[PDB]
Amino acid sequence: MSLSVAEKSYLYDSLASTPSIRPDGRLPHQFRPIEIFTDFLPSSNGSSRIIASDGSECIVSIKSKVVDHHVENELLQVDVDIAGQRDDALVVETITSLLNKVLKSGSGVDSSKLQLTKKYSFKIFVDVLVISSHSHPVSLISFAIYSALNSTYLPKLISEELPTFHDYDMVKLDINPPLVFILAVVGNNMLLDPAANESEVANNGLIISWSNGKITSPIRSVALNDSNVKSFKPHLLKQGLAMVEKYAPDVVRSLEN
Amino acid sequence: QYNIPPEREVLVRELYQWRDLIARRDDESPRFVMPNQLLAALVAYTPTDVIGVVSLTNGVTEHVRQNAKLLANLIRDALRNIKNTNEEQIRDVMERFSVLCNSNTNSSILLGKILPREEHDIAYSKDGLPNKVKTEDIRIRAQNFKSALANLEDIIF
Amino acid sequence: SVQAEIGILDHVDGSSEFVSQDTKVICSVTGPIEPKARQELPTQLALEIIVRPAKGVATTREKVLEDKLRAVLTPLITRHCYPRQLCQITCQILESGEDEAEFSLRELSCCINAAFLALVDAGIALNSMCASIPIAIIKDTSDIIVDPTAEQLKISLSVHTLALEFVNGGKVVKNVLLLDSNGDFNEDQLFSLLELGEQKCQELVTNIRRIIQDNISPRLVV
Amino acid sequence: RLLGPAAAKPMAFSSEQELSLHTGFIENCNGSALVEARSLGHQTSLITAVYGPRSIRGSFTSQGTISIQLKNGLLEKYNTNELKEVSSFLMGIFNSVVNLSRYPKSGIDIFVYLTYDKDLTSQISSLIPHCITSITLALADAGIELVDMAGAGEANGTVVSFIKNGEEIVGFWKDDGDDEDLLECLDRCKEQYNRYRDLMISCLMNQ
Amino acid sequence: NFQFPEIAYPGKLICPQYVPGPGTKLIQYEHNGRTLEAITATLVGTVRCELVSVLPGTEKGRKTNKYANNDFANNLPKEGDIVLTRVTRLSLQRANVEILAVEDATFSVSQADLGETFRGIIRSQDVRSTDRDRVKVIECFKPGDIVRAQVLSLGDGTNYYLTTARNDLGVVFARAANGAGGLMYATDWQMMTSPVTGATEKRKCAK
Amino acid sequence: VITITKRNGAFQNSQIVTPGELVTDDPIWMRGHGTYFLDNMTYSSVAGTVSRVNRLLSVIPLKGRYAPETGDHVVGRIAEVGNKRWKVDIGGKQHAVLMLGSVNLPGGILELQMRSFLKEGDLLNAEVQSLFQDGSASLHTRSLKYGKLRNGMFCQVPSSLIVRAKNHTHNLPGNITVVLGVNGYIWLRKTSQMDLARDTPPSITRLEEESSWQIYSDENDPSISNNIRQAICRYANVIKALAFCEIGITQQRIVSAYEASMVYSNVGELIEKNVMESIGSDILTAEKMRG
Amino acid sequence: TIEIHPITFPPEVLARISPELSLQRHLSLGIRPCLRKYEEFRDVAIENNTLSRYADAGNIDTKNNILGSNVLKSGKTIVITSITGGIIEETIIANYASVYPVVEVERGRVGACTDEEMTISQKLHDSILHSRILPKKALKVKAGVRSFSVLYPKWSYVLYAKIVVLSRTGPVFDLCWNSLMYALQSVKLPRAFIIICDQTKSVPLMINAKNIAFASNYGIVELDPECQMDKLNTVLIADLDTEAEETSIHSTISILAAPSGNYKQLTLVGGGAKITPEMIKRSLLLSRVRADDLSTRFN
């Protein structure tokens, strides 16, 4: 985004006060309406398209491949491609390396839920395509892969020889997909799910990962803007971190529906 | 346009508005009664006397000659007007500074012994053996070059 | 005996084609022309040297070929009389005439001669003239021979590419432009070939002058 | 760049934390440093160079722009995707420490070379606290202004960078590890940050 | 007015509110009480009192000039400063140059060639002191000459505004035929001649 | 709480002319916008409706951007600073130019430090003075009413949803002043001293106004009422709500939707898509079917 | 006839406004801008087998791939030369091989390989092959079969190289060559069985120690009477360094000298001053002593 310094001081003073007045007036625990479409790519096992309120749209496709897990290290490879950005861009490889950690085969998702024979297993290819974006999309892609993995169907196994699969029947992918949230701190107030203008005048940002009803390992604290970058008190680190522990079940109840 | 000091803005204002009223009185163009060439000349010479306006070096128009006594009286009015406006709890916060201040070797592991090595120049003798030069030898040559650099004050043929 | 033709291209200021044994190199010179931002020099002329192999793309093998050819033509051109200007000098090797992977001396010797010829046809200020020859020694007789063939290189111990500079009717040698060598040699054999290489390049410019006169003279007052 | 023939295959074989600090020894850039850490079965040896500040032609920004880049050295070559991930985390920290408002219309380029990363038995978590202490020494040698020293520590994957004697946190990084290990991981790095903080000043004051 | 330690490191507190300056910034700290405006040094060097400023480097580093490339990058040419430039481009009504040094005598070497270096423009109206409207810049400067020109208004969108309308300003070092000849020396006010070659070239001399 | 709309199975949920068809064969017409003449016959270049005003034949396209016309009160931010001219982003097909002589300078006739008081990204309002050959607009700030915006928040609406009225700016209850631009750039700020004192209530050859940089300063008002800032956030939602329901924006419909927001009495429940369709329907039905 | 005083400048800005003028003023005193005399070199300090898996002959590394290393430093430049290993299956100069270096000079820039990085990588490959250092019979693999129990009595070795130059101040073509010759003598070829390499067992590389050589660059500078006159006198500068010398000196001589009075490579560029046979013989003899000190510096 790009704003004027006159209105940057207005949003900074309005978000750092004790009432913590938000631009659109939403509460610090509220979110923006999101539209999610699933199951529309027959050539893929799973698929999802997510549309945000500000115009950010992202498409996720899921493919599968039988590979020997004794020689294949990671079974969940995420390929991120942002339109208008190079494949070797600095902002693309960071999310590519960050999503590979939130969906690591064994850590973020247990490999036992996609094993076949004692030798072979399914490898999940998560292809991400960001059509448009106005803020940090790591939280939007997590919502897209969540609905895509929960709407994925893989072929059923028939059973040391090469595995055979059924022609008609296909089993559902029962996998708990981790969730990623973005939090912005403005002076001394926490903001869950910031906007393009909120994250532009914020002091610092927080990335929390949620899996199996708990805060899982891959978390970050990357700055949301290079202008106003300030250090935060450790009491703010645990405030927003414990804040998602109260409202994330309300997110999953509305997302897993 | 003619580079007139901004301090004389009160003078050109009186002459421009008088030029406009006379141009409207006799139904003439403002340049017919006083062109921009003559306007800049009246504000520069500032003719106080009745002769300085009519006997100007560049020449005047018919309206300036007939109204010579009036314009020579206006510059005298503006000259005396432009000259009229020119004349007219520390120790309580210092102790907090000193009480907060109370809250406050391996040479190498792998490459720490090779990289921080300073310059070492060597010389080869006639037989073929290295001769390391001391840091004082290169220092003698340093001041010998700077002193001989600022001692050039004459050039011959 | 070598063959050479001048003025063969229609869309460059100067063109040339140097043929020796089996190596054939076509060069193209264009200048002075408007340089780019990163190329323009405040005082003297800028050079854009580009050589290309016969097979495959331009790898790092030809990059050192450009840097050595650049050092031969840079002192040969009066650069100071073309301030803030550019001159493109492209060398295209049609036939290598040797082994590209094991050798690269005959192509450097032909690119130097082909570039100098194209610099003459384009009308660029040259302080002197140039001549380059390849030199190698057979491990059998251990004697110095000029322009060795492709079979004579595989048996050679050390290779040489001597480039000289001639003035005063192609007789006086002003300075040794380039002498690139790789292999096994000593100081006794260095001057043993440097003296022999000076008289083989003297008859080369004498042969170059005859060639560049049979073609430029008819185009002038004739 | 030769790389050799493509038909060739690579070889396949079937408490206390020592620290070393240096600075300078580089003439290209303005300020440099070299940190080395040898503890248990893992050694770290990386070089940091700061080429700045350089005035940007045609720029009109109100404050400076930091450019941090991690480059693979010669051993334990990480993936390029994770190298830029730590760089973006390093820029998110140093954008709050380096006085950006002092250098308008100019940028600062950081070059950290993880030359020798060795393990003797995410592996990048242990190297992050060593990269932060190498840039602060290099930024101070280049005459660049930094608001207080910046250091970090490791506590089983969790990497937290503090400032102002550990009063306020500037950055937070965690990979792998366990669950509910927060306050203990903070204090394990809080006392480790002070271990790296005063050691940087002791090396930067010697001659 | 000097009870503080001699040397200072980034983060060391100096004195309360005193005024800030080069190497300090008003940072409010908290020690179980109200926030006090503390001036904190952000450079490695000694503190000086006049006006509070922290100058980088040691006294030996200032005399030996160990921070050569660090001094010019931190001290930008302000208004009225007299600098040493090099002619790069010659236009009909201007002359693009390249700032190489700046004085307060003593100077400071610029950045080491490649771009991203400070450049300026000497307008034809500010070349000479008399007849400022009609001049011939081709008779005043040549590409590759060191020119001593004083800066003017800072419209630094890309270049700087310089002037040579004085006696001690102009070409201070040049060579015949744009570097292809011998070193020339300034004789008259607009006549430069090389002793060995004997050739004369019209410049804007400074003697 | 979150409201997530879900789907499954699919990817998603006068005279109309198309480009390439014949609209008329009568040569006695004036070819307008979205129309190309050819072989004494008229064809349409875009898709839309046919308009026949006088002898001017033109096609009104469906999705049309902002067309800059002479004498339009617009709002735009500076995109770049050039040689004595600043390209401002109005939202049209190109960047509108703002010559240095089109704004009030405090120094006057007495200095290329243009970026000092007006850099890139700064928001302001002005009026279109004229147009260029390619359609680019030329703005000017020769009035005290036009100045650098501050003490508020910026928002954007589609250009085809702004109705042209007499007064471009209006004063709203709650000490709030709205600035409606025909380009679609709205500025919601607290009422200043100017919009409050003017929007609501022979030897003379004219003189020049003495205006300082007091209107170009980036320093906003120090003390803004907390009760007023919550009103601005309540105005930004109801404006984007009417734009979500393709409703024309006028001064009477801004204050009408403001009373409907008091039923919920919270500025956070307005971002939902269900409450926007209801408040939008409460205006089209309780106003157009009652008067 | 003429008498005009010149304009003086401090030595700091003298090298910036004109590297040619600063270079001529030093040679009038018999010194160089590098604070060195005419035929003075720079001391070196090397560390072989320091970054390799075989650093400790008793306690081998658990996870390492480098076969040998050499941290060379001459003056203020730093050269690091590691060597990785590979293997290819196969089915007078042709009997010898070479190395595949990846020169990466760090100067503070980003992008692909510089023209300098690609010229050193090829000149190193061309000098190793012509000097005959690695015969093709030394790359063969005595591949056995394990059944564990390994036994030893077509496959051939492929040797890579990565050179990282830091704090560059001049032409580093000679520093990378000397650092490679040191790093060559420290690598060990791991044994291979039936293909998998051995974890601990290694074999020393068969390097043709007869043809080993070292690098040394020189320069021919032409003076001038205007900086402290029919004709003039030229001097020879050994081991060029600093931006002043590399920019102004347009006539250099870089050579590879081997023991027993043998030479492996010579480049004779005479762009600047005239290269007389006097300075040709002097550069050759001055390099034979340089190669004797380097080969007998630490080993």
UniProtKB/Swiss-Prot annotation, chain A:
<dbReference type="GO" id="GO:0071038">
    <property type="term" value="P:TRAMP-dependent tRNA surveillance pathway"/>
</dbReference>
<dbReference type="GO" id="GO:0006401">
    <property type="term" value="P:RNA catabolic process"/>
</dbReference>
<dbReference type="GO" id="GO:0005730">
    <property type="term" value="C:nucleolus"/>
</dbReference>
<dbReference type="GO" id="GO:0005634">
    <property type="term" value="C:nucleus"/>
</dbReference>
<dbReference type="InterPro" id="IPR020568">
    <property type="entry name" value="Ribosomal_Su5_D2-typ_SF"/>
</dbReference>
<keyword id="KW-0271">Exosome</keyword>
<dbReference type="GO" id="GO:0000467">
    <property type="term" value="P:exonucleolytic trimming to generate mature 3'-end of 5.8S rRNA from tricistronic rRNA transcript (SSU-rRNA, 5.8S rRNA, LSU-rRNA)"/>
</dbReference>
<dbReference type="GO" id="GO:0034476">
    <property type="term" value="P:U5 snRNA 3'-end processing"/>
</dbReference>
<keyword id="KW-0698">rRNA processing</keyword>
<dbReference type="GO" id="GO:0000178">
    <property type="term" value="C:exosome (RNase complex)"/>
</dbReference>
<dbReference type="InterPro" id="IPR027408">
    <property type="entry name" value="PNPase/RNase_PH_dom_sf"/>
</dbReference>
<dbReference type="GO" id="GO:0000176">
    <property type="term" value="C:nuclear exosome (RNase complex)"/>
</dbReference>
From Swiss-Prot, chain D:
<dbReference type="GO" id="GO:0071038">
    <property type="term" value="P:TRAMP-dependent tRNA surveillance pathway"/>
</dbReference>
<keyword id="KW-0698">rRNA processing</keyword>
<dbReference type="GO" id="GO:0034475">
    <property type="term" value="P:U4 snRNA 3'-end processing"/>
</dbReference>
<dbReference type="GO" id="GO:0000177">
    <property type="term" value="C:cytoplasmic exosome (RNase complex)"/>
</dbReference>
<dbReference type="GO" id="GO:0071051">
    <property type="term" value="P:poly(A)-dependent snoRNA 3'-end processing"/>
</dbReference>
<dbReference type="GO" id="GO:0071028">
    <property type="term" value="P:nuclear mRNA surveillance"/>
</dbReference>
<protein>
    <recommendedName>
        <fullName>Exosome complex component MTR3</fullName>
    </recommendedName>
</protein>
<keyword id="KW-0539">Nucleus</keyword>
<keyword id="KW-0963">Cytoplasm</keyword>
<dbReference type="GO" id="GO:0006396">
    <property type="term" value="P:RNA processing"/>
</dbReference>
<dbReference type="GO" id="GO:0000176">
    <property type="term" value="C:nuclear exosome (RNase complex)"/>
</dbReference>
<comment type="similarity">
    <text>Belongs to the RNase PH family.</text>
</comment>
Swiss-Prot record, chain E:
<dbReference type="GO" id="GO:0071038">
    <property type="term" value="P:TRAMP-dependent tRNA surveillance pathway"/>
</dbReference>
<dbReference type="GO" id="GO:0005634">
    <property type="term" value="C:nucleus"/>
</dbReference>
<dbReference type="InterPro" id="IPR048626">
    <property type="entry name" value="CSL4_N"/>
</dbReference>
<keyword id="KW-0539">Nucleus</keyword>
<dbReference type="GO" id="GO:0000177">
    <property type="term" value="C:cytoplasmic exosome (RNase complex)"/>
</dbReference>
<dbReference type="GO" id="GO:0000176">
    <property type="term" value="C:nuclear exosome (RNase complex)"/>
</dbReference>
<comment type="function">
    <text>Non-catalytic component of the RNA exosome complex which has 3'-&gt;5' exoribonuclease activity and participates in a multitude of cellular RNA processing and degradation events. In the nucleus, the RNA exosome complex is involved in proper maturation of stable RNA species such as rRNA, snRNA and snoRNA, in the elimination of RNA processing by-products and non-coding 'pervasive' transcripts, such as antisense RNA species and cryptic unstable transcripts (CUTs), and of mRNAs with processing defects, thereby limiting or excluding their export to the cytoplasm.</text>
</comment>
<dbReference type="GO" id="GO:0000956">
    <property type="term" value="P:nuclear-transcribed mRNA catabolic process"/>
</dbReference>
<keyword id="KW-0271">Exosome</keyword>
<dbReference type="GO" id="GO:0005730">
    <property type="term" value="C:nucleolus"/>
</dbReference>
<dbReference type="InterPro" id="IPR019495">
    <property type="entry name" value="EXOSC1_C"/>
</dbReference>
<dbReference type="GO" id="GO:0006396">
    <property type="term" value="P:RNA processing"/>
</dbReference>
From Swiss-Prot, chain G:
<comment type="similarity">
    <text>Belongs to the RNase PH family.</text>
</comment>
<dbReference type="GO" id="GO:0034476">
    <property type="term" value="P:U5 snRNA 3'-end processing"/>
</dbReference>
<comment type="subunit">
    <text>Component of the RNA exosome complex. Specifically part of the catalytically inactive RNA exosome core complex (Exo-9) which may associate with the catalytic subunits RRP6 and DIS3 in cytoplasmic- and nuclear-specific RNA exosome complex forms. Exo-9 is formed by a hexameric base ring of RNase PH domain-containing subunits and a cap ring consisting of CSL4, RRP4 and RRP40. Interacts with NIP7 and NOP8. Interacts strongly with RRP46.</text>
</comment>
<dbReference type="GO" id="GO:0006396">
    <property type="term" value="P:RNA processing"/>
</dbReference>
<keyword id="KW-0694">RNA-binding</keyword>
<dbReference type="GO" id="GO:0000178">
    <property type="term" value="C:exosome (RNase complex)"/>
</dbReference>
<dbReference type="GO" id="GO:0000176">
    <property type="term" value="C:nuclear exosome (RNase complex)"/>
</dbReference>
<dbReference type="GO" id="GO:0005737">
    <property type="term" value="C:cytoplasm"/>
</dbReference>
<dbReference type="GO" id="GO:0035925">
    <property type="term" value="F:mRNA 3'-UTR AU-rich region binding"/>
</dbReference>
<dbReference type="GO" id="GO:0000956">
    <property type="term" value="P:nuclear-transcribed mRNA catabolic process"/>
</dbReference>
<dbReference type="GO" id="GO:0034473">
    <property type="term" value="P:U1 snRNA 3'-end processing"/>
</dbReference>
<keyword id="KW-0597">Phosphoprotein</keyword>
